[PDB]
Design a protein around this ligand. Structure first.
Ligand SMILES: COc1cc(Nc2c(C#N)cnc3cc(OCCCN4CCN(C)CC4)c(OC)cc23)c(Cl)cc1Cl
Length: 266
């Protein structure tokens, strides 16, 4: 036990949110004062370690653009508590009612916060391993955060989002992370479409390894799709840092596309 543990009776579960073969996720209150999100366990389903060693990683990380780990409880019902992100994943947010109103500036800006959260991950010497719209959460005012560190390791699998070297040879790096980021940019520019439309896993891996790359999304600026291609370089070390990515996105409409004019969708 560490100073991350709270009583169960501190809490209270209310409205369900998702289910799983891991447990489930609720809106809660904390000590009567704090809307939280609680992630329960189905007591025998996962290890004690397994369900939580994702959140040892969440103790050693702390950034505005990552989701805030609040507390843990470690006898079943076993829980982990976090800040409540009001709009759920970015995937849903992008497919939902509001998605179609989003244009480049809100999208580039969301990519920015994310890049920023990862750029911190980057300098904390870590890799996330499952980066994609659906592991990003949204709050109000278009605030995006990275979460789902359930595979996040210190540097001593969904292939569409995964880097080649990482899928074939288990070579995960912050640079493999950059690869996903680049796919995530295409989610953001398509308003949530699945990568490699009409292609199946083995088709992706085969074509990706042949050097195919997703082409420019409709209405997306070539400068934006170039950045993506930089992220998908066959050579991970030649792939840009997230700190490069963070600043390039933040300064996007001034330094790169000062002449951006809104279109039908973007
Ligand atoms: C607590 O522990 C963990 C929780 C999570 N997942 C979440 C975190 C976190 N973190 C924070 N906030 C969340 C809010 C959610 O729902 C919001 C309501 C959805 N709607 C959108 C549409 N409109 C119209 C109604 C509202 C949600 O379920 C979709 C999951 C959340 C992860 Cl991934 C890992 C750990 Cl360890």
């Amino acid at each position: 036990k560490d100073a991350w543990e709270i009583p169960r009776e501190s809490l209270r579960l209310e409205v369900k949110l998702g289910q799983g073969c891991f447990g489930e996720v609720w809106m809660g209150t904390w000590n009567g004062t704090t809307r939280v999100a609680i992630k329960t366990l189905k007591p025998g389903t996962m290890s004690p370690e397994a369900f939580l060693q994702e959140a040892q990683v969440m103790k050693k990380l702390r950034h505005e653009k990552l989701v805030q780990l609040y507390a843990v409880v470690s006898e079943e019902p076993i829980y982990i508590v976090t800040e409540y992100m009001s709009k759920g994943s970015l995937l849903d947010f992008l497919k939902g009612e509001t998605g179609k109103y989003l244009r480049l500036p809100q999208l580039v800006d969301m990519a920015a916060q994310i890049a920023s959260g990862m750029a911190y991950v980057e300098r904390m010497n870590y890799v996330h391993r499952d980066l994609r719209a659906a592991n990003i959460l949204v709050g109000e005012n278009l605030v995006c955060k990275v979460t789902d560190f359930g595979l996040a390791r210190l540097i001593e699998f969904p292939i569409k989002w995964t880097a080649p070297e990482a899928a074939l040879y288990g070579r995960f790096t912050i640079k493999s992370d950059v690869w996903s980021f680049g796919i995530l940019l295409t989610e953001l520019t398509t308003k949530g479409r699945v990568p490699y439309p009409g292609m199946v896993n083995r088709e992706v891996l085969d074509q990706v390894e042949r050097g195919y790359r997703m082409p420019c999304p409709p209405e997306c600026p070539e400068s934006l799709h170039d950045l993506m291609c930089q992220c998908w370089r066959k050579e991970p070390e030649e792939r840009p840092t997230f700190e490069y990515l963070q600043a390039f996105l933040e300064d996007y409409f001034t330094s790169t596309e000062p002449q951006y004019q809104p279109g039908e969708n973007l």
